[PDB]
Design a protein around this ligand. Structure first.
Ligand SMILES: O=c1ccn([C@@H]2O[C@H](COP(=O)(O)OP(=O)(O)O[C@H]3O[C@H](CO)[C@H](O)[C@H](O)[C@H]3O)[C@@H](O)[C@H]2O)c(=O)[nH]1
Ligand SMILES: *[C@@H]1O[C@H](CO)[C@H](O)[C@H](O)[C@H]1O
Ligand SMILES: [Hg+2]
Ligand SMILES: [Mn+2]
Length: 277
């Protein structure tokens, strides 16, 4: 019993793309009513999970800043569980969590190549969804550790499957997209096809949707492997493949995952989350 016109007003931003050929909204600053959604979701006692991985140097360079900013800005006012995957828990920074946040740490086996660390996430996440995340949360987000929340990343971001507009190509055209183009990759996207180029630093949805995203992506990662090939942008190419065959129900503007090295365009009203230094 919740409708688009209840919380979303596109006309608040006519200059940017707020809707998709498939009726899915694209959230931009000013286009949303958190207050109504906060109220709507709190009634439902909704709870949101956030998985984040950090093996090796990334642990001391980013984990703490990630957790600290998430604590302060992610789904504030709703129960959230942080799922922390590390290779060495003794190096795990323990920050002080605030109201409605709790966490769980897990020790994972550290892959030799970072590219595989990043890709093996697809398999791990899936294992954890089937094991417990499926039963602990209503919505799940999977993020990259080397990020930082800047402002409120709220419930205006929930949906059945949520993708992130890659900051450097949302304004671009599809054939410029660095999709995988080698028909030998499961991640292959013809030169005619493609809707957008999604950032893999942030994807989410319901546990069931996320389990499907992650399963399909790992199968792709494995198919490509038995074929002695590696998608150019690894898991992100597979995700883009996936999000093409299965359009996302919600897409988030680059304002949610902004690269300040792109400066500060006029079409990015307020930055919720930026890439790390
Ligand atoms: O030594 C490392 C490097 C990375 N990570 C993790 O791997 C992920 C990606 O990190 P990184 O490669 O530094 O980010 P980017 O290249 O900007 O990542 C983009 O590209 C990758 C594929 O190249 C993945 O798809 C990411 O999701 C996408 O945001 C993060 O969760 C990191 O914490 C580690 O745990 N240890
Ligand atoms: C997606 O691909 C870009 C290249 O455009 C870059 O590797 C980013 O790290 C990734 O998110
Ligand atoms: Hg890396
Ligand atoms: Mn990253």
């Amino acid at each position: 019993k919740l409708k688009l016109s209840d919380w979303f007003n596109p006309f608040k931003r006519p200059e940017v793309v707020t809707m998709t050929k498939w009726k899915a909204p694209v959230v931009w600053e000013g286009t949303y009513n958190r207050a109504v959604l906060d109220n709507y979701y709190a009634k439902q006692k909704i709870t949101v999970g956030l998985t984040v991985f950090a093996v090796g140097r990334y642990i001391e360079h980013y984990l703490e800043e990630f957790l600290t900013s998430a604590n302060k800005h992610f789904m504030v006012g709703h129960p959230v569980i942080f799922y922390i995957m590390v290779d060495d828990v003794s190096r795990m920074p323990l920050i002080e969590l605030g109201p409605l946040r709790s966490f769980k740490v897990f020790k994972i086996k550290p892959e030799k190549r970072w590219q595989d660390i990043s890709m093996m996430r697809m398999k791990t996440i899936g294992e954890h969804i089937v094991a417990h995340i499926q039963h602990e949360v209503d919505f799940l987000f999977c993020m990259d550790v080397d990020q930082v929340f800047q402002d409120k990343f709220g419930v205006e971001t929930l949906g059945e499957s949520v993708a992130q507009l890659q900051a450097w190509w949302y304004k671009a055209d599809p054939n410029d997209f660095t999709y995988e183009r080698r028909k030998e990759s499961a991640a292959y996207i013809p030169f005619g096809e493609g809707d957008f180029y999604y950032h893999a630093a942030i994807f989410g949805g319901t546990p069931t949707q996320v389990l499907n995203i992650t399963q399909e992506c790992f199968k792709g990662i494995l198919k490509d492997k038995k074929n002695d090939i590696e998608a150019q942008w690894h898991d992100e190419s597979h995700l883009n493949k996936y999000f093409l065959l299965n359009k996302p129900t919600k897409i988030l503007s680059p304002e949610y995952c902004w690269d300040y090295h792109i400066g500060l365009p006029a079409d990015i009203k307020l930055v919720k989350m930026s890439w790390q230094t």
